[PDB]
XYZ file of C-alpha atoms in Angstrom:
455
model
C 63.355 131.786 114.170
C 65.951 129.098 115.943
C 69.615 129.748 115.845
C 70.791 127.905 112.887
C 74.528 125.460 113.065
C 76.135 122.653 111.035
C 76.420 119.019 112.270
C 77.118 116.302 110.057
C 77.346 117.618 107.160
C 74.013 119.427 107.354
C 72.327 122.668 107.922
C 70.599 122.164 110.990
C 68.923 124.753 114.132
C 69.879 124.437 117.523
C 67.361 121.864 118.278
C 68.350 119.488 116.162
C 66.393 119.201 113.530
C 67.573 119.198 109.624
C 66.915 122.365 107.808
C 66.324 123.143 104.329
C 67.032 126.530 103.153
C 65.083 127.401 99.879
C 64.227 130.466 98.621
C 65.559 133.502 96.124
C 68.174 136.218 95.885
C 66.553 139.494 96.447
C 68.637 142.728 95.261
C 66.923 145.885 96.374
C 69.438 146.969 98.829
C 72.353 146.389 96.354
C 73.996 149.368 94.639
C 74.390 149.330 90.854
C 75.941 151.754 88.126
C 72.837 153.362 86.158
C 74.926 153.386 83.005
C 73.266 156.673 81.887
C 69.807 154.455 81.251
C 68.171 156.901 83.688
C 65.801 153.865 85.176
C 65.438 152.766 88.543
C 68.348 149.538 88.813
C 66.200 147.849 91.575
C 63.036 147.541 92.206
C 61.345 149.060 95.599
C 62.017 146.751 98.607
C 59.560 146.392 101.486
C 57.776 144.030 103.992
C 55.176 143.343 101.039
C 58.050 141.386 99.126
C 59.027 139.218 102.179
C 54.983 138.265 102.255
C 55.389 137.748 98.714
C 58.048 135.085 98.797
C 56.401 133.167 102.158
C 53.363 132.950 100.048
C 55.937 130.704 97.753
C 56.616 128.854 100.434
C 60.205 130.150 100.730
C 61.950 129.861 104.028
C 65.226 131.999 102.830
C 66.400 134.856 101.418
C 69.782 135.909 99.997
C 70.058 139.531 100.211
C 72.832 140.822 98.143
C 74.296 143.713 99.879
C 76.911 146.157 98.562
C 80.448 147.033 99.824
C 80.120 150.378 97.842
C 77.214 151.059 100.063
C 78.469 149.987 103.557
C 82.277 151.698 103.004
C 81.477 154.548 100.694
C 84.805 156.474 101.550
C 87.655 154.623 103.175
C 86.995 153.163 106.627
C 83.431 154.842 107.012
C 80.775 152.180 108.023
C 77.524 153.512 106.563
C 74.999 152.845 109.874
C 72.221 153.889 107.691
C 72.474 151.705 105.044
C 72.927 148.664 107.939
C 69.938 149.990 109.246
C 67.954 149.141 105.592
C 69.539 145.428 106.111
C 68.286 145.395 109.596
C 64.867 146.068 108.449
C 65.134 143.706 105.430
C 65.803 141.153 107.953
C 63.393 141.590 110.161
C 60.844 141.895 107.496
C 62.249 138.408 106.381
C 62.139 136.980 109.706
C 58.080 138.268 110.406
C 57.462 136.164 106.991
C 59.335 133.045 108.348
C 62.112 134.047 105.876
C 66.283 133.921 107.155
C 68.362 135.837 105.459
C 72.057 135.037 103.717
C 73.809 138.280 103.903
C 75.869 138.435 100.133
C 78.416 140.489 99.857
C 77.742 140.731 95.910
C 79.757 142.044 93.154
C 79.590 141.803 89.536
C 82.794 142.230 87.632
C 84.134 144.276 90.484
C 81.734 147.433 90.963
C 80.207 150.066 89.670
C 83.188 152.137 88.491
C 84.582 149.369 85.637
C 82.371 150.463 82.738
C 84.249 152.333 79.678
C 83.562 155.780 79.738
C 80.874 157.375 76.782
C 83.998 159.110 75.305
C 86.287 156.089 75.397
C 87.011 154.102 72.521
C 87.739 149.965 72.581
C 90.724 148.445 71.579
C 90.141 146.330 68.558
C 88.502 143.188 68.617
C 86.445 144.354 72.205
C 83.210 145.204 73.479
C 82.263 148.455 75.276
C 82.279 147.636 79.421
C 79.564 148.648 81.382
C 79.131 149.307 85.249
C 77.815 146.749 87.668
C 78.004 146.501 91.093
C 80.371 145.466 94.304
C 83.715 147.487 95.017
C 83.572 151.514 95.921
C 86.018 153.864 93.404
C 88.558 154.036 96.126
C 88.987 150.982 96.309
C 88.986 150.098 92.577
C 92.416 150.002 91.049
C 92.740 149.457 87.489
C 96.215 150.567 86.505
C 94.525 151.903 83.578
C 93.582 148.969 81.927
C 90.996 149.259 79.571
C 87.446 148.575 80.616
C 86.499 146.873 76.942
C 86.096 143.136 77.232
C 86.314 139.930 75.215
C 83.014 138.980 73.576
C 81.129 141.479 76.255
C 81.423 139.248 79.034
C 81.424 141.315 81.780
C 84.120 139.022 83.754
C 87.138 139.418 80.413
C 87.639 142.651 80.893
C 91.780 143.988 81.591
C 90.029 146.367 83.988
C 88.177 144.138 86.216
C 90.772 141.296 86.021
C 93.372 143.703 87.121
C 91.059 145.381 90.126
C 90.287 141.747 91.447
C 93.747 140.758 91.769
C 95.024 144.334 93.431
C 92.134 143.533 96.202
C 93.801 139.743 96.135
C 97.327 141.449 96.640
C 96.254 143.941 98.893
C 97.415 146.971 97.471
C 96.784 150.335 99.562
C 95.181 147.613 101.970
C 91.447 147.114 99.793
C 90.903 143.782 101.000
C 91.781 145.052 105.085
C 88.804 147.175 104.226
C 86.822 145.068 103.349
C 87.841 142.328 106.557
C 86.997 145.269 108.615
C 83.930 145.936 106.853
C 82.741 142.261 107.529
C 83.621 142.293 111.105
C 81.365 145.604 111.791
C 78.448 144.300 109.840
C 78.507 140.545 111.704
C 79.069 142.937 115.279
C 75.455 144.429 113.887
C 73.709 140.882 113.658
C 75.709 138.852 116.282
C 72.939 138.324 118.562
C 70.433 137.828 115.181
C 69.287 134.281 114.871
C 67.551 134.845 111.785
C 70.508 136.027 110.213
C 71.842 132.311 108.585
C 75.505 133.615 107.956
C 77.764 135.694 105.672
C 78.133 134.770 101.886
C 82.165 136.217 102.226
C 82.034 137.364 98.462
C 80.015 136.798 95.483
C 81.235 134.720 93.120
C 85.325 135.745 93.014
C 86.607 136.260 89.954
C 90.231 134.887 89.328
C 92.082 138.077 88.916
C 95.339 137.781 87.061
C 95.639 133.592 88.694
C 94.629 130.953 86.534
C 91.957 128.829 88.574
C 94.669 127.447 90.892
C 96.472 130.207 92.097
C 93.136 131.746 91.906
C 91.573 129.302 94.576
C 94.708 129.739 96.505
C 93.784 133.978 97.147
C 90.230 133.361 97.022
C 90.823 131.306 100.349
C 93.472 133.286 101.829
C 90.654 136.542 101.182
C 88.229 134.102 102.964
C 90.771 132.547 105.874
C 91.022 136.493 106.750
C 87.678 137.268 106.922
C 86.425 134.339 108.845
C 88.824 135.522 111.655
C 87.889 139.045 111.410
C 84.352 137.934 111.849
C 84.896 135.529 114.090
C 86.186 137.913 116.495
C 83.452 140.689 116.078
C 80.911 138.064 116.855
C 82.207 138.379 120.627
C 79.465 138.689 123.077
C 76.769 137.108 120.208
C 77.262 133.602 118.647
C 78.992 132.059 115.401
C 76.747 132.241 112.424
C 77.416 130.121 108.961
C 80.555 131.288 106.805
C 79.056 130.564 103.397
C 81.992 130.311 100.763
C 82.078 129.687 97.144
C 84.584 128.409 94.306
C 85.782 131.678 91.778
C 83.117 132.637 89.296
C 84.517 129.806 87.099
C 81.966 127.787 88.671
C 79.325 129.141 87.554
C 80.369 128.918 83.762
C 81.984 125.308 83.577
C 80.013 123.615 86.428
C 82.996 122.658 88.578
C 86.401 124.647 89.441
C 89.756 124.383 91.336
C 88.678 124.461 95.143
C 89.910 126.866 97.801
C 92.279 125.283 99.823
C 90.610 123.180 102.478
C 93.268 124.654 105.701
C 91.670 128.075 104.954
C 88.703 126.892 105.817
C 89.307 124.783 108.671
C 85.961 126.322 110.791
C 83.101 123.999 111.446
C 80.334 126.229 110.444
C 81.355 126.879 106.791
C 78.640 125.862 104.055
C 80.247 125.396 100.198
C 77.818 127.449 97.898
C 78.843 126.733 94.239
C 76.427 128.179 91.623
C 75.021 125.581 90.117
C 74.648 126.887 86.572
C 74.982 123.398 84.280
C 72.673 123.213 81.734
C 71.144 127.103 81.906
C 74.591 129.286 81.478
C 77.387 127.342 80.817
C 79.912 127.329 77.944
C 78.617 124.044 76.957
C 74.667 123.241 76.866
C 75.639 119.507 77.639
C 77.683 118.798 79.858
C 77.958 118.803 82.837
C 74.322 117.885 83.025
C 71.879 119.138 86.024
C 72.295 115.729 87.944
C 75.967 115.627 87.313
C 76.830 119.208 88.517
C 75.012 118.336 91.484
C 77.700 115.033 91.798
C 80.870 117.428 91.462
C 79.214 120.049 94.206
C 78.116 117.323 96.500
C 81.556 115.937 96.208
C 83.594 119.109 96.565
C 81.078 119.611 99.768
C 82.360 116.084 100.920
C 86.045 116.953 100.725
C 85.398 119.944 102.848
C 83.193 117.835 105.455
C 80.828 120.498 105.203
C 77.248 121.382 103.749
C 76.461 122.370 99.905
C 73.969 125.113 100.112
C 73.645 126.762 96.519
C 73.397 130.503 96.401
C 72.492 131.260 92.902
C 70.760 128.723 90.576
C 68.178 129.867 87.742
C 67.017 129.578 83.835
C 66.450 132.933 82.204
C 64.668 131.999 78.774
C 61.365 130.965 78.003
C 59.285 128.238 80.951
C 57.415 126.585 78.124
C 60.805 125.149 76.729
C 62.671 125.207 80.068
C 60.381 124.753 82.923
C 61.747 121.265 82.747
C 65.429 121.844 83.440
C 64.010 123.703 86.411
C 61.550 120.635 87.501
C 65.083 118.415 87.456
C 67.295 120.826 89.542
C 64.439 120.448 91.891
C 63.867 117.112 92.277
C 68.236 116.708 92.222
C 68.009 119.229 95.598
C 65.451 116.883 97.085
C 67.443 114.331 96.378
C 70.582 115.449 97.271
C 68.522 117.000 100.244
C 70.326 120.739 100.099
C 68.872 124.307 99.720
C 69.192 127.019 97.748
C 68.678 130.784 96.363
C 66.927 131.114 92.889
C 68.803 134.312 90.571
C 66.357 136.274 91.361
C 63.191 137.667 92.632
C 63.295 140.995 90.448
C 65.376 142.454 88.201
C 64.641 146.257 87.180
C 64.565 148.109 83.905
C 67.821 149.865 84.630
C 70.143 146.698 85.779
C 72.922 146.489 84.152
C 72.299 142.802 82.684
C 68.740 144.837 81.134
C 71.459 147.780 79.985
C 74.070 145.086 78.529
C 71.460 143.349 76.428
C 69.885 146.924 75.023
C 66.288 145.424 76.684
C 65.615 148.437 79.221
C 61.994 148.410 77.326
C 61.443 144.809 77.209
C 60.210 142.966 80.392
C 62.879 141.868 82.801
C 62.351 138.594 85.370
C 62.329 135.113 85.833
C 59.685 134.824 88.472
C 58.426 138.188 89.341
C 57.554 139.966 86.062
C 58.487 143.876 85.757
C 57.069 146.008 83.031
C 59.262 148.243 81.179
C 59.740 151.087 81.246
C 57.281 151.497 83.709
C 58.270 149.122 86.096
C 55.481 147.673 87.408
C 55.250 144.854 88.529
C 52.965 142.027 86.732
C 52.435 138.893 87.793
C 54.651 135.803 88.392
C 56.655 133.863 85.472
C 54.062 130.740 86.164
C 55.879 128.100 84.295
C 59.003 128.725 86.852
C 57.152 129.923 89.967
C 55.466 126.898 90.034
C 58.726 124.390 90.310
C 60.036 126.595 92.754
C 56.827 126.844 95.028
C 56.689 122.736 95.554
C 55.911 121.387 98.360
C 59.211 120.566 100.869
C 60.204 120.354 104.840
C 61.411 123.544 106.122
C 62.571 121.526 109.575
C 62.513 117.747 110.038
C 64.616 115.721 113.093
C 66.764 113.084 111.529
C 65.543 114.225 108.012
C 66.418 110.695 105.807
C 64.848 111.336 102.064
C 63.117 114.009 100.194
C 61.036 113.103 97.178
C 58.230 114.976 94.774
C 55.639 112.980 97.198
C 56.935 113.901 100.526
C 59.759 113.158 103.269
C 61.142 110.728 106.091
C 63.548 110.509 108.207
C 63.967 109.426 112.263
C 64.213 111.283 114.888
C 62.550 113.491 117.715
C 60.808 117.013 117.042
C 58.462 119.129 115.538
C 58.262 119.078 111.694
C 57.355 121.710 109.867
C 56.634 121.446 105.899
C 55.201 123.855 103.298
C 52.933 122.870 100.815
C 51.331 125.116 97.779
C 48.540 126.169 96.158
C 44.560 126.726 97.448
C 43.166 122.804 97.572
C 44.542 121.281 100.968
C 46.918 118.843 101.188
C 45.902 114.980 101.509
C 48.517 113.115 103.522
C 49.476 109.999 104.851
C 50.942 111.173 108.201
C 52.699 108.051 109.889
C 54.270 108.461 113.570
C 53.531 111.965 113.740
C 51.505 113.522 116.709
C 49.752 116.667 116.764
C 49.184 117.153 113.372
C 48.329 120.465 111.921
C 47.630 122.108 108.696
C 46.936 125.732 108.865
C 46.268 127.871 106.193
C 48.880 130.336 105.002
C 48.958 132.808 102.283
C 49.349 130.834 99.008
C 49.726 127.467 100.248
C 49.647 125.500 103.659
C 52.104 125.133 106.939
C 51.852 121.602 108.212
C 53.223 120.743 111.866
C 53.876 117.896 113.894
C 56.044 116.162 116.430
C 57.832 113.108 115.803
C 59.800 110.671 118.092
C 61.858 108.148 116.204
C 60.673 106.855 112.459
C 58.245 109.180 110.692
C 57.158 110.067 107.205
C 54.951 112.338 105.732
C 53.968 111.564 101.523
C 50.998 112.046 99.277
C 47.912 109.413 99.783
């Protein structure tokens, strides 16, 4: 709806008021290798999704979109497949949703998997396709595919293919500059487009996570101008970067250099992982990997926004680590994209695991092999369908019993679930709670102190 900015740290609209951005990464338009499972890789994506996630009260969506798909031979700019983000977007924006566009990759692409008649070298695991990079621009030098322990990042192949794009070689990452610039020309004028997500978690190529910050910024530096330029005649949208893909196994990482991403629209969007994925189980904890991000956000004067955040085992023993990275983004007032609304039968993380007949999802559950669709993972749906503000002037403090803050214009809050809210509304006009799918909108105008909690 408004034209979103950054002031002070914060994710805010145009009219001032603070905005939290909470919601789930949603794959359908994203392009994976089938891996010769001969299952669908996504599930179907339409406007009933985008109803879907409203009815959880989510105000965001982070689409991960495909650079195989937009540039599927060098320097062609797929219209068609912009036209399927288009009407992802506006599907988003009918349901009150705005949409991150992700340029997403896993361990490079598609075309990094080892081959059914290739052997492994000894002591590695058989690679398998994912998603990101087209062939041409995938350049291996032959190394092999097989990776350490069958983590999909330690592979020679992909390690090799991330740092030719960081080098340049036969101009890969010019492509995909120019590939960014013609998708934010398509959504210049868009307000309900938040911004660009430059590149899914980067891996470090052939850096270690110093060097690898340094051409993970440089990659980012070249983009934002590219953009920045193509936005001509529209407005500047958010530049949402992230640390390499290191983050999202250790909880913290070396940071881009700050000078390449001296623009005062960029968001920091570290996954915050601790405690569901990491190499250790411990440490850091949920509330301390919050610390580090908010930090890092600090040094670059800008807001933390998380992109990917999720546990992927059973709710009755973990629906409590995701009840604590809730309450730490109330308190640390930031939003962020659950991993993920669906995940198919055929994906490669079903393929990797050998559970293409098991069911696959964390919050919407898929059948397999059928792949239908069967209810909602409660025991996680429910921590990520609490009640929050979507838009609040001067927002001040977020807690599990409602919000404050000072300043002048209309608030508008989400609350689940059939039984209607009971609230203590203080300094706020016009009250209104209206009945939404699956929950409640409340809205009101404030004008200087205000606060909004649980009788």
């Amino acid at each position: 709806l408004p034209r979103l900015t950054v002031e002070d740290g914060a994710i805010k609209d145009v009219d001032g008021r603070t905005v939290l951005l909470r919601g789930a990464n949603v794959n359908g338009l994203n392009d994976y290798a089938s891996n010769g499972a001969g299952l669908p890789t996504v599930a179907p994506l339409d406007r009933t999704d985008f109803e879907a996630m409203a009815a959880l009260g989510f105000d965001v969506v982070r689409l991960n979109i495909a650079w195989s798909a937009l540039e599927p031979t060098p320097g062609a700019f797929d219209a068609a497949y912009v036209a399927r983000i288009r009407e992802a977007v506006q599907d988003a924006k009918d349901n009150g949703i705005y949409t991150v566009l992700d340029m997403h990759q896993d361990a490079w692409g598609p075309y990094v998997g080892t081959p059914e008649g290739q052997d492994c070298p000894p002591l590695l695991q058989r690679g398998i396709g994912w998603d990101g990079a087209p062939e041409w621009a995938t350049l291996t030098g032959g190394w092999t595919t097989c990776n350490i322990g069958g983590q999909r990042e330690a592979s020679p192949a992909v390690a090799r293919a991330f740092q030719a794009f960081y080098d340049d070689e036969q101009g890969v990452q010019g492509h995909l500059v120019q590939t960014w610039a013609r998708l934010a020309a398509e959504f210049r004028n868009e307000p309900a487009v938040v911004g660009y997500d430059l590149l899914n978690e980067p891996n470090p190529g052939l850096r270690d996570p110093f060097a690898a910050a340094d051409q993970i910024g440089r990659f980012y530096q070249r983009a934002i101008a590219a953009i920045r330029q193509a936005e001509t005649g529209g407005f500047p949208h958010l530049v949402i970067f992230e640390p390499s893909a290191l983050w999202s196994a250790f909880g913290f990482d070396a940071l881009p250099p700050r000078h390449y991403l001296a623009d005062p629209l960029v968001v920091f969007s570290p996954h915050l992982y601790s405690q569901s994925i990491n190499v250790s189980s411990e440490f850091p904890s949920i509330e301390d990997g919050f610390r580090i991000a908010v930090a890092a956000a600090d040094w670059y004067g800008a807001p933390l926004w998380t992109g990917e955040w999720g546990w992927f085992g059973d709710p009755d023993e973990q629906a409590g680590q995701v009840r604590r990275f809730v309450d730490a983004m109330n308190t640390h007032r930031i939003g962020g994209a659950w991993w993920s609304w669906t995940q198919a039968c055929g994906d490669p993380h079903a393929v990797k695991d050998g559970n293409t007949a098991e069911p696959q999802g964390n919050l919407n559950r898929i059948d397999c092999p059928s792949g239908e669709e069967q209810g909602l993972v409660e025991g996680f749906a429910e921590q990520l369908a609490r009640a929050y503000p979507r838009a609040a002037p001067g927002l001040t403090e977020v807690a599990t019993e409602g919000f404050r803050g000072d300043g002048s214009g209309r608030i508008e809050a989400w609350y689940p679930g059939a039984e209607r809210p009971q609230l203590d509304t203080v300094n706020v006009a016009d009250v209104a709670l209206t009945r939404v799918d699956g929950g409640w909108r409340l809205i009101g105008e404030a004008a200087g102190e205000y606060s909004v909690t649980t009788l």
